[PDB]
Amino acid sequence: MAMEDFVRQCFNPMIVELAEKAMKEYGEDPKIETNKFAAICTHLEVCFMYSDFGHRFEIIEGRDRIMAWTVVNSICNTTGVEKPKFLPDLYDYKENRFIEIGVTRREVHIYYLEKANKIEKTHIHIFSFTGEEMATKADYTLDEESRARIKTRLFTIRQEMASRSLWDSFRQSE
Numbered sequence: 001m002a003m004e005d006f007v008r009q010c011f012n013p014m015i016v017e018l019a020e021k022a023m024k025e026y027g028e029d030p031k032i033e034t035n036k037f038a039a040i041c042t043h044l045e046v047c048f049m050y051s052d053f054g055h056r057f058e059i060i061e062g063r064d065r066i067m068a069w070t071v072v073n074s075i076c077n078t079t080g081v082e083k084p085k086f087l088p089d090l091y092d093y094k095e096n097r098f099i100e101i102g103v104t105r106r107e108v109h110i111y112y113l114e115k116a117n118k119i120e121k122t123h124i125h126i127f128s129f130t131g132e133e134m135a136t137k138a139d140y141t142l143d144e145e146s147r148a149r150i151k152t153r154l155f156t157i158r159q160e161m162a163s164r165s166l167w168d169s170f171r172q173s174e
C-alpha cells in the first residue's frame, strides 16, 4: 500500500511509531487501516507542532494513558481547573486551559460542532487541509505565523497524498 509507504516517507519515525503503537495495542493493523494510520499521524504531528510553537504548552496527546492522566491530574491539582472527562490534546499555561485539537477533511464548522458536542471547559481548535480553521470564541491561541505553518504542513500532506492518488480515499474516510 502506497498509503503505508507515504506515511513512512512523510512523518518522522517517532510520530510513525507512536501512531503504530496506538493502533497495534488496540488490535488495529496499520497496514489494513491505512487511512486511520495516516490520520493519527497527521493529528499527532499537528499536536506536536502546536506545542512546539510555545514551554507554553503541555502535550497530552501521544503519551500512554497513565502518563496523560498523570499530566492532566498534575495540572488540575496545581491550577484548580476542572478535570476533563476525556483526554484533551494540550494544556495552555498562558490561558490556563486545555485544548482539543481537531484536524478535518470536512467543513471546519462541522468538525467543530462534533468536538464541542463531544465535550466542558476545553478550548477547541480545528484545522482543515484547506487552510481553514475554527476555534472557540474565534480565539486562535497561536500567532498567525505558527498557525500558517500548521496549515502549510496540512495542505502539503493533502497534496502529497494527491500526488500519490491517496487523497480521494483519505478524504472520504473521516
Ligand SMILES: Cc1cc(-c2nnn[nH]2)ccc1-c1cc(=O)c(O)c(C(=O)O)[nH]1
Binding pocket: 035, 036, 037, 039, 040, 043, 061, 087, 088, 089, 101, 102, 103, 173, 174
Ligand atoms: C486522529 C484520529 C483518527 C481517528 C480515526 N479513526 N478512523 N480514522 N481516523 C479517530 C480519532 C482520532 C483522534 C482525533 C483527535 O483529535 C484526538 O484528540 C484523538 C484522541 O484520541 O485523543 N483521536
Ligand SMILES: [Mn+2]
Binding pocket: 061, 087, 088, 089
Ligand atoms: Mn487527543
Ligand SMILES: [Mn+2]
Binding pocket: 043, 089, 100, 101, 102, 103
Ligand atoms: Mn484532538
